[PDB]
């Protein structure tokens, strides 16, 4: 059963997308593998949460809102839903070799990191040096007045 808190928002969201264009109705019917009739898929959404999710992946425009709210009230489907919906990210031909050149470089940062502290520190310390000189003067002067 789909939880009402979700379903309240979910059902009209889908129905709106259907009324927007018919072209999606055929798509979701293919992905979910349900009868092409708009009344059919809407009967399926209510029945299973897993199904409800795949529909909201097919339409991301208006539907993204409910989907997240579905995800909240159902941590269960979260794992299963993540698997059923997947697309291999196209990899660039240059990428893996292009990464090979930075081997020398990153090992240099991590030598500097360990010395300073956490990476957060080094990002700070780097700015402190890059920082304008006057500021060093400013801080010295406040200490001249007594301020710490």
């Amino acid at each position: 059963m789909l939880l009402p808190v979700v379903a309240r928002a979910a059902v009209p969201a889908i129905e709106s997308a259907i009324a927007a264009t018919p072209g999606l109705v055929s798509r979701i019917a293919a992905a979910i593998g349900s009868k092409v009739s708009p009344s059919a898929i809407l009967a399926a959404v209510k029945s299973n949460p897993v199904v409800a999710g795949l529909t909201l992946a097919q339409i991301g425009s208006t539907g993204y809102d409910a989907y997240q709210q579905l995800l909240e009230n159902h941590p269960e489907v979260a794992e299963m839903l993540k698997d059923l919906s997947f697309k291999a990210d196209e990899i660039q031909p240059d990428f893996i070799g292009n990464l090979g050149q930075y081997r020398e470089e990153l090992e240099l940062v991590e030598d500097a990191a360990r010395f300073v502290g956490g990476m957060s520190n080094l990002i700070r310390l780097r700015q402190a040096l890059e920082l304008d000189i006057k500021y060093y003067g400013l801080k010295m002067q406040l200490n001249d007045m007594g301020y710490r």
Binding site: P75, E76, R114, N143, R148
Partner: protein
């Protein structure tokens, strides 16, 4: 934990070098120079772990004790030392006790006015607290000290079975003082011994011979009592006027020692020739603690001057100067062998005896007793409070620390370190910047906890050697006094195990009498030098106190250094207290465990009053900070994290397979020994009570959510460990023993080492 390279001291140890101490920063000191052999058989040490309670109620103005509280103060609070403190004390004295108007007021405050009263019959006795309350009103003075020294004064003089009752009392705490005397610390030890010449006058029979005429003759007349008193306060004050200059007394008596030690003393200038009495000097000839002082003098002053007469006079100061340091000060004369006995040493060996790294540590036996007191006030806006001891909270805490004191003992860290320095090096020592030396000093780190000073400020001062002036003057003392306390503890140590030492003048271009620096003669079989000195001829001589340590054979600590707990239960219950407020900290602990079960998030927050099993939430209670315990466990967390930084650093270097599995076996082999310590901590009753309560709130939180699957799941391979640990890190945090950010990282070590998943077995200590 301090970490330095013995080869180059100039860079990393510089403040701990001797060439800094005597103030030549350009170059190292040549062994070759005039040399005058001598023997150090004695030294001045403030006692380690001296904690006592001193009742100031009633009695008599015990002369010595009240001097020490001037000393204990001017040291504690900066203030530009004691000379101010003293002369102000005369002001105040010349403001009030020398002023008869205020005396008459008290008499009006106690009996009545303009009447004839009769002693002990129509005269009612009054508690000392009362007349004190009036001193606050009458005398608007800065320090509560000034009032107590006057209070017990008036208590003494007017009491031939008189106005004061025996019952009332106060008490005060004997705090840790800097152990080895700094130069200024001598100056004060003279002046503090000035003021008990003052006090022993107000306690004197000449002040007493007032009472001697009033004993059996009764006290009838209010003025003719008070006036008869007020004079006797000024007369005993006229006499006490005057005093020697500590600035001059010290400066001289060092210098006329300084001419004794130094190899270059032209024929005439030596003491034995122009001094009448050679006794006094003989005893202070051999004294070490003065030497390191004498170095402090010449560094700061830049010169030396006498301005005392050459014999007759300097033979009547010294025997009095022997007294000042003998008693008044917390500093007591000790045979030098037995002052540093508790220090110990262990080396990371390779072949011939040549150390890869050498570690010097202070041996402690973990001090576990925690008294949790609470404030109680009969009076408004008064520092002085009763403090209630609360048994059983002590016994919950001490029930927890009983297992803790077993596994955190400091003797077990150093066997852990050396084992690392062995696995890690894999290679000849000469390279990688020569040998290194690491040392750490809980007892020094302690001193910054009591002052709530970050110990990380000093240990960053040494390497650079120079202090930052941007901080306030009361901090610079606290830093520069502590930067010293290392340097003293080093040289008392090195001299203890290498009895043979020699003194030598320094050389510089322009206008300097110069300074004295020791040069040790140490013989040991190593065919290779560490630090840099010749190691030629089968013996080696070095200026630096550190290099003279490394050559030592391993040492076992002779005696545990044990901290007696401050004992409140005895004297606190019936009596007011001192500035308790900062010495202890408030008792509250607010922390929330979390876990996720059947893909459903659960949370149980827990507070401090429940964990003990106290129904009431009571914030009125506070915990006395056990800094010696926070010192050790802070150290352990420092070293432990320092390991895993090196191993994972030492692993990626090797680039060889047979070794990597020695290291990857070392990381894991710690992370279980760790994961067992924490869990064994969890079993402790404070441990247990956090466990039971952590689950119980989740079960009952769950049953409402409507599913009981818990009971099976929270006892599992993981989530029984997870909650077990988190209870083990809470108990450390709910005490002072660790900082919640430090535990958060200490977790992340168990994350990667994956020691957790590979155990799957719990031990219950019931």
């Amino acid at each position: 934990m301090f970490n330095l390279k013995v080869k180059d001291l100039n860079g990393s140890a510089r403040g701990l070098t001797q060439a800094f101490a005597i103030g030549e920063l350009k170059n190292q000191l040549s062994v070759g120079a005039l040399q005058l052999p001598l023997q150090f058989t004695r030294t001045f040490s403030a006692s380690m772990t001296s904690e006592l309670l001193w009742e100031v109620g009633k009695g008599n103005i015990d002369p010595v004790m009240y001097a020490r509280l001037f000393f204990q103060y001017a040291q504690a609070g900066g203030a530009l030392s004691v000379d101010e403190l003293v002369n102000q004390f005369t002001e105040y004295h010349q403001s009030t006790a020398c002023n008869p108007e205020i005396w008459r007021k008290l008499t009006a405050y106690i009996t009545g006015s303009s009447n004839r009263a009769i002693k002990a019959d129509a005269v009612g006795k009054v508690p000392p607290t009362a007349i004190l309350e009036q001193l606050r009103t009458l005398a608007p003075s800065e320090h509560e000290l000034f009032h107590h020294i006057t209070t017990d004064f008036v208590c003494h003089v007017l009491s031939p079975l008189g106005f004061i009752l025996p019952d009332a009392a106060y008490v005060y705490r004997v705090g840790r003082t800097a152990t080895y005397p700094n130069f200024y610390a001598l100056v004060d030890c003279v002046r503090a011994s000035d003021l008990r010449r003052m006090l022993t006058a107000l306690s004197s029979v000449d002040s007493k011979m007032l009472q001697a005429t009033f004993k059996a003759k009764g006290a009838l007349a209010p003025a003719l009592i008070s006036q008869h008193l007020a004079n006797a306060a000024t007369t005993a004050f006229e006499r006490s006027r005057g005093n020697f200059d500590a600035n001059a007394v010290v400066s001289s008596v060092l210098t006329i020692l300084g001419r004794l030690w130094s190899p270059s003393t032209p024929k005439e200038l030596d003491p034995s020739a122009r001094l009448r009495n050679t006794n006094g000097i003989d005893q202070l000839r051999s004294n070490l603690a003065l030497f390191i002082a004498y170095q402090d003098m010449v560094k700061q002053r830049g010169r030396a001057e006498v301005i005392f007469s050459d014999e007759e006079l300097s033979s009547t100061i010294i025997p009095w100067f022997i007294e000042a340091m003998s008693e008044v000060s917390p500093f007591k004369l000790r045979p030098i062998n037995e002052t540093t006995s508790y220090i110990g040493q262990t080396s990371a060996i390779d072949h011939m005896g040549q150390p890869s790294h050498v570690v010097v540590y202070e041996d402690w036996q973990f001090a576990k007793e925690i008294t949790a007191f609470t404030p109680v006030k009969l009076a408004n806006n008064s520092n002085q409070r009763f403090l209630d001891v609360e048994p059983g909270i002590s016994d919950r805490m001490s029930a927890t620390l009983a297992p803790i004191g077993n596994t955190f003992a400091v003797s077990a860290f150093v066997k852990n370190r050396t084992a690392v320095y062995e696995a890690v090096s894999q290679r000849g020592t000469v390279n990688s910047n020569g040998a290194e030396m690491t040392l750490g000093f809980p007892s020094v780190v302690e001193r910054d906890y009591a002052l709530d000073r970050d110990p990380m400020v000093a240990i960053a001062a040494l390497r650079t050697g120079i202090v930052d002036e941007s901080l306030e003057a009361r901090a610079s003392n606290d830093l520069k006094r502590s930067m010293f306390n290392y340097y003293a503890a080093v040289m008392h140590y090195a001299v203890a195990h290498n009895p043979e030492v020699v003194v030598s003048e320094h050389q510089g271009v322009a206008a300097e009498q110069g300074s004295l620096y020791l040069v040790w003669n140490v013989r040991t079989e190593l065919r290779i030098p560490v630090g840099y000195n010749a190691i030629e001829g089968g013996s080696i001589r070095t200026p630096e106190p550190l290099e003279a340590i490394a050559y030592n054979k391993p040492i076992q600590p002779s005696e545990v250094l044990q901290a007696k707990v401050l004992d409140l239960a005895n004297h606190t219950t019936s009596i007011h207290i001192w500035p308790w407020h900062e010495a202890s900290t408030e008792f509250a602990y607010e922390d929330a465990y979390s876990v996720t079960i059947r893909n459903k998030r659960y949370t149980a927050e827990v507070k401090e009053f429940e964990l003990l099993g106290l129904g009431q939430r009571r914030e009125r209670v506070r915990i006395l900070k056990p800094t010696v315990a926070h010192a050790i466990i802070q150290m352990w967390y420092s070293w432990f994290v320092e390991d895993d930084r090196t191993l994972a650093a030492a692993r990626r270097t090797s680039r060889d397979d047979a070794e990597k599995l020695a290291i990857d076996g070392r990381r894991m082999q710690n992370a279980v020994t760790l994961l067992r310590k924490i869990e064994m901590i969890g079993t402790t009753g404070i441990g247990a009570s956090a466990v039971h309560l952590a689950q119980s709130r989740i079960v009952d939180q769950m049953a409402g959510r409507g599913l009981i699957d818990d009971s099976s799941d929270l006892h599992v391979g993981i989530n029984r460990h997870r909650i077990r640990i988190w209870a083990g890190l809470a108990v450390l945090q709910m005490m002072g023993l660790l900082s919640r950010s430090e535990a958060e990282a200490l977790t992340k070590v168990l994350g990667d080492s994956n020691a957790l998943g590979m155990v799957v077995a719990t031990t219950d200590i019931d």
